[PDB]
Amino acid sequence: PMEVDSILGSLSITDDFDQLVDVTSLFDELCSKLKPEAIVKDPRFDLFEGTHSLEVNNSKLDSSLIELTAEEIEFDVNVAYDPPLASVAAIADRLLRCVISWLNDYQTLPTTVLSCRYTESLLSSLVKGSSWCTGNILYDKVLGSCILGVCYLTKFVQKLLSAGIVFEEEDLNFNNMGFNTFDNLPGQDVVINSLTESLQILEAYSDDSLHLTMLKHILKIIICLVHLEDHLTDYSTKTSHLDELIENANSVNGIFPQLQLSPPKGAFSTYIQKHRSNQFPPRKITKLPTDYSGFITLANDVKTILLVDKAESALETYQFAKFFNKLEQRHVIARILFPLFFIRDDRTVLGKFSYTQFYLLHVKEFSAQTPGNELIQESSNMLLEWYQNCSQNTCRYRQGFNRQLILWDSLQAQFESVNSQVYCSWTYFMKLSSMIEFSLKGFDLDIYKPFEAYSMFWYVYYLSHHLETFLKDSQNDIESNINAIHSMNKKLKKLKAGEKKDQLRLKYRFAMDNEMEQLQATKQFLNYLLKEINITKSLCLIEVFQFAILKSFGLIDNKNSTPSKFSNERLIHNLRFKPFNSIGVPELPEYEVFQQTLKDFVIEEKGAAFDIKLERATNFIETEVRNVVSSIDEIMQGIKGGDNNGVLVTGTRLVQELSLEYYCKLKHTSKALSVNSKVIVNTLKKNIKNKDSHEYKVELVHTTEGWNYFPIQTLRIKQD
Amino acid sequence: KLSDFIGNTLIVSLTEDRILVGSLVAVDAQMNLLLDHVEERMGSSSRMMGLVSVPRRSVKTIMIDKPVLQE
Amino acid sequence: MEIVYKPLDIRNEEQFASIKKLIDADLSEPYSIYVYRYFLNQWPELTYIAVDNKSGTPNIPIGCIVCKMDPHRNVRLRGYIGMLAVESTYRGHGIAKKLVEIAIDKMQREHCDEIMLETEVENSAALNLYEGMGFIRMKRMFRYYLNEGDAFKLILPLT
Amino acid sequence: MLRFVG
Ligand SMILES: CC(C)(COP(=O)(O)OP(=O)(O)OC[C@H]1O[C@@H](n2cnc3c(N)ncnc32)[C@H](O)[C@@H]1OP(=O)(O)O)[C@@H](O)C(=O)NCCC(=O)NCCS
Ligand SMILES: [Cl-]
Ligand SMILES: [Cl-]
Ligand SMILES: [Cl-]
Ligand SMILES: [Cl-]
Ligand SMILES: [Cl-]
Ligand SMILES: [Cl-]
């Protein structure tokens, strides 16, 4: 090699080995002798571990073969590149946009934050015990503080992933490349004072170009980003630094068009993947975002997380976990923070209740009956795991239910053997609600194929019937207890002063003070649950009717229409409903019940008799959609009004906007089902009349502004 | 035999300047090597790479420490 | 075009090299020699190639499929399709479908209870092939692949 | 398609 150091280094490459012997000739001779299929390895060693291996001289698998431009190859961190103000502001700008790409865009740490040569230089000094001195204040002080503040944010992210709240290298990548800063990294106050000192330098600085104004906001943004650890260490609920982060990011977004930024070449590169220890294949650097809109998303997502602290009942925390991450997937930082903010270190929920007391509130508000048991201890753990599953990504969210359904079922059956009716009832509600949620979530993930829509929509309709039946019986008992208390009041007006009246007034006043308020609240909550579950039940029945109409014309079937030679329709069906196979109540209907129910829905007639039954099915879809729209409108009304109007209790005080937004999209999807039903009819009737008929297929289409638990079964021409 | 070599540190020289130091995990009939705890040395620079497999055509020289060889 | 389907010959070096080169270009996830070595040396009966008899080099396989089988849990044998690729100039001729048929037929004769594979949700060509054979989607994996795309886990139940 | 994992 031409470089002197490489020449001098090659002399002492193998100096730690006193005597080396060429065994290349011996290896070749023995390997030629061996059979082509044989592999020499430790018999205990598993060959599956070899699949995780990198390969030399493999462009996809070799980090060393990465190609670098001249500017990237050297780039001494000590050189102050001209112009200093424009370059420092451009370096600091790209670093922030590297963090957004890492967290918001789920990109890898080495190709984002560690891609900067400055951050590598700083962390290497921290591993030992600023890291570079350039002679220029902007790079030495203003830029040195920016790198320190970002490296501090990464360490805080490591503390979050250490909790195992979210899955690593899926929701968030933390490939530290072997870095361990230990306790050497300074404290939050020191990092903040460094950034604050740099801001004061800029105010005194003479150059008044737009780059200075943007560099001030970049220092301010890092300051407000460092304050993110305040919500975990101190459980801060103050939106002061989250609002400053939003105001700072708004000011920079209007600054990007007025000026063009280009950092010194070689500042951000794949250099670190080439000359630092790396057990992973090389990776290109994905295009960074053009604006700071990620910090606004992150700041808004964290503000939402802190709102759960303001909850005053179990139902308010329950609906928060049900709506804060339902419409779209929240920022990974916010998703990790919620269980850590909810389930605190002191083994308390939000610092207010213990794990068992928090569980008892859910049973109390659901049953309206006043309550170190091992079943209570286990159910409490199960409830917290249910809360933590709500903050998982849209795919893991469904997979979490696959594990809960059998533990809820086992727990319920354990409550049943001891004849604990209240806890068995509540567990049944969580188990059955999860089965419906688990099933319907598959449509949002396009899990089921169009031929499977009937099986799943009718099964949910089957489940929704059982849940409505259960909730209605619960509400009748609740109303029964209310009427009993109302009966004591009537019995007191017709009574005269006496010993027997004093016993009744004492009984009545006890029930009004300790029971009536909860009875009314639980009843009104069950009223909302009944409207919520009938919207589910109706929508499912609309989907089944739509499917049945499609099969009536011969356009779809509840089995795979393509001929296969290895499986049958029953085996495929049992595999689809495998998760619900071991659950006893409600039992999974047999394969025969699925087949017979569909044949009842399918219009077997032809001609004018067909027209009457077809109009009957379409008339139901159009009328039920309007019924669904009215139920959603009534729910949306109660949400706007609150939980003190006397009819509906929704517990949506903390997620009011999200809940109305959810039901709005649910209303959009409902109207789409009615419109689609009419298009399908006018098309198929005309297609049958025409002797040349298009070949149609059905696809599960998602409404752009609707709820994709109920996709639109849409006709489409095959063509070529 | 080739068996006893498994699990013993070896030195592998590639076509370029870089040299791989690792422990032989496995060997196939075409003398493709699987090495764990691989340390890559390019002149003065050195770095870790973990589990690496090297094709026969990439291997220029296979050296072992003579003491470890006799051990 | 005269497509011939035959099992992999473990001693042949060119078949091995052609399979790897074919799979490396067409598949996005990178594989080392020992990925193929784990499949081919342990399940040599579960890899099939498609060659063109009328081609300029009849020995070179234009399509291949790489599979394996292991007990899943304790009571079931789970066949697994690791790689499947067909040359760009040979696509649209039913070659991949035949390779998947002969491999699943092989795994079924070996008393597999199910077949499993992972494919990209954006890979419509592969989804149509398997779902057309009875495969259904059992799982969606968030950003499963190196290219950050989601994956579907497809399972075909045989018993 | 089998996925690579470290
Ligand atoms: C997928 C791939 C192997 C197809 O090869 P092929 O020989 O053209 O496939 P076939 O000719 O056997 O097609 C058979 C079935 O597969 C589907 N199929 C194949 N190509 C398709 C395409 N563009 N679009 C939709 N379906 C397609 C069809 O349903 C087709 O059924 P049909 O014959 O009734 O129309 C090839 O495109 C490829 O190499 N893709 C990248 C690698 C990959 O897909 N791996 C899958 C994960 S293991
Ligand atoms: Cl509840
Ligand atoms: Cl309540
Ligand atoms: Cl009990
Ligand atoms: Cl639920
Ligand atoms: Cl079928
Ligand atoms: Cl054959």
Numbering used by the authors:
A (entry chain B): 0 to 128, 133 to 374, 382 to 730
B (entry chain C): 5 to 75
C (entry chain A): 1 to 159
D (entry chain D): 1 to 6
The authors write:
The transfer of an acetyl group from acetyl-coenzyme A to the free α-amino group on the N-terminus of substrate proteins is catalyzed by N-terminal acetyltransferases (NATs), and is considered to be irreversible, as no Nt-deacetylase has been identified so far. NatC acetylates protein N-termini starting with methionine, followed by a hydrophobic or amphipathic amino acid, with amino acids at positions 3 and 4 also contributing to NatC recognition. NatC forms a heterotrimeric complex, containing the catalytic subunit Naa30, the small auxiliary subunit Naa38 and the large auxiliary subunit Naa35. The large auxiliary subunit Naa35 acts as the central assembly hub of the NatC complex, forming extensive interactions with Naa30 and Naa38.
To obtain insights into the substrate recognition mode and the marked difference of NatC catalytic efficiencies toward the two peptides, crystal structures of NatC in complex with CoA, and either yArl3 or Gag peptide were determined to a maximal resolution of 2.99 and 2.75 Å, respectively. The electron density of the peptide ligands was sufficient to model the first four and six amino acids of the yArl3 and Gag peptide, respectively. At peptide position 3, Gag-Arg3 forms a hydrogen bond with the protein backbone and a cation–π interaction with Naa30-Tyr144. In addition, Naa30-Glu29 interacts with the Gag peptide backbone. Only in the Gag peptide, the fourth peptide residue, Phe4, deeply inserts into a second hydrophobic surface generated by Naa30 and Naa35, the “extended pocket”. In particular, binding of the Gag peptide induced a marked constriction of the central tunnel in NatC. Binding of Gag induces a flipping of Leu27, allowing recognition of the N-terminal methionine, which is sandwiched between Leu27 and Tyr145 of Naa30. In contrast to the yArl3 peptide, binding of the viral Gag peptide induced a large conformational rearrangement of the β6–β7 loop in Naa30. Naa30-Asn147 forms a hydrogen bond with Naa35-Gln106 in the apo and CoA/yArl3-bound NatC structures, but traversed a distance of 8.8 Å in the Gag-bound structure to form an intramolecular hydrogen bond with Naa30-Glu120. Moreover, Naa30-Leu146 moved ~5 Å toward Gag-Phe4, which complements the extended peptide pocket.
